[PDB]
Amino acid sequence: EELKNAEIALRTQKTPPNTAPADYFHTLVQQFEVQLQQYRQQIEELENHLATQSNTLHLSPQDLSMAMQKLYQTFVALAAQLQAVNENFKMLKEQ
């Protein structure tokens, strides 16, 4: 990334021998708009994981059955989407 920016800047010096900057500043703000949100989500997730770590000792051995049935449900849905997409690819192959 740095080397590409450097080749670009060398070219800009070659040709040289304010709209773009404000555009760059706008995009800079834009990117981090979502990154502050990612921070918010990571922070909620970390506080929640610490909440779980509080229960972490011996707790209830039923949430395991709960998450395992959730695993059956999520794997079923993922296999649905997988077979669907693969059948669409076979459809394009036939066409």
Partner: peptide, 14 residues
């Protein structure tokens, strides 16, 4: 993302 996925799910739980 599985720690963050358990985070989203358990955060939905707790």
């Amino acid at each position: 993302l599985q720690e963050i996925q358990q985070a989203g799910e358990r955060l939905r739980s707790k």
